[PDB]
Amino acid sequence: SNKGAIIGLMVGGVVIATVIVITLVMLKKK
């Protein structure tokens, strides 16, 4: 409650950032 649940999305978002990094690595190919 009150910016309290905002942390919840920060937990499952750590894995979303791991894929974004490798993404830029696949772009240089083309």
Swiss-Prot record:
Site (Cleavage): V15, I16, A17, T18, L24, V25
Tissue: Expressed in the brain and in cerebrospinal fluid (at protein level). Expressed in all fetal tissues examined with highest levels in brain, kidney, heart and spleen. Weak expression in liver. In adult brain, highest expression found in the frontal lobe of the cortex and in the anterior perisylvian cortex-opercular gyri. Moderate expression in the cerebellar cortex, the posterior perisylvian cortex-opercular gyri and the temporal associated cortex. Weak expression found in the striate, extra-striate and motor cortices. Expressed in cerebrospinal fluid, and plasma.
Outcome when changing V21I: In AD1; increased amyloid-beta protein 42/40 ratio
PTM field: Proteolytically processed under normal cellular conditions. Cleavage either by alpha-secretase, beta-secretase or theta-secretase leads to generation and extracellular release of soluble APP peptides, S-APP-alpha and S-APP-beta, and the retention of corresponding membrane-anchored C-terminal fragments, C80, C83 and C99. Subsequent processing of C80 and C83 by gamma-secretase yields P3 peptides. This is the major secretory pathway and is non-amyloidogenic. Proteolytically cleaved by caspases during neuronal apoptosis.
Impact noted for substituting V21M: Increased amyloid-beta protein 42/40 ratio. No change in apoptosis after caspase cleavage
Compartments in which it is found: Cell membrane; Membrane; Perikaryon; Cell projection, Growth cone
Site annotation Implicated in free radical propagation: residues: G8
Impact when changing L9V: In CAA-APP; Italian type
Region (Interaction with PSEN1): 1-26
Highest taxon of source: Eukaryota
Transmembrane feature ranges: 6-26
Annotated site (Susceptible to oxidation): M10
Reported induction: Increased levels during neuronal differentiation.
Known disease link: Alzheimer disease 1: A form of Alzheimer disease, a neurodegenerative disorder characterized by progressive dementia, loss of cognitive abilities, and deposition of fibrillar amyloid proteins as intraneuronal neurofibrillary tangles, extracellular amyloid plaques and vascular amyloid deposits. The major constituents of these plaques are neurotoxic amyloid-beta protein 40 and amyloid-beta protein 42, that are produced by the proteolysis of the transmembrane APP protein.
Comment text on domains: The transmembrane helix undergoes a conformation change and unravels partially when bound to PSEN1, facilitating cleavage by PSEN1. The basolateral sorting signal (BaSS) is required for sorting of membrane proteins to the basolateral surface of epithelial cells.
Miscellaneous information on this protein: Chelation of metal ions, notably copper, iron and zinc, can induce histidine-bridging between amyloid-beta molecules resulting in amyloid-beta-metal aggregates. The affinity for copper is much higher than for other transient metals and is increased under acidic conditions. Extracellular zinc-binding increases binding of heparin to APP and inhibits collagen-binding.
Family to which this protein belongs: Belongs to the APP family.
Quaternary structure and interacting proteins, as annotated: Binds, via its C-terminus, to the PID domain of several cytoplasmic proteins, including APBB family members, the APBA family, MAPK8IP1, SHC1 and, NUMB and DAB1. Binding to DAB1 inhibits its serine phosphorylation. Interacts (via NPXY motif) with DAB2 (via PID domain); the interaction is impaired by tyrosine phosphorylation of the NPXY motif. Also interacts with GPCR-like protein BPP, APPBP1, IB1, KNS2 (via its TPR domains), APPBP2 (via BaSS) and DDB1. In vitro, it binds MAPT via the MT-binding domains. Associates with microtubules in the presence of ATP and in a kinesin-dependent manner.
Entry protein name: Amyloid-beta precursor protein
Gene for this chain: APP
Full-protein residues shown: 697 to 726 of 770
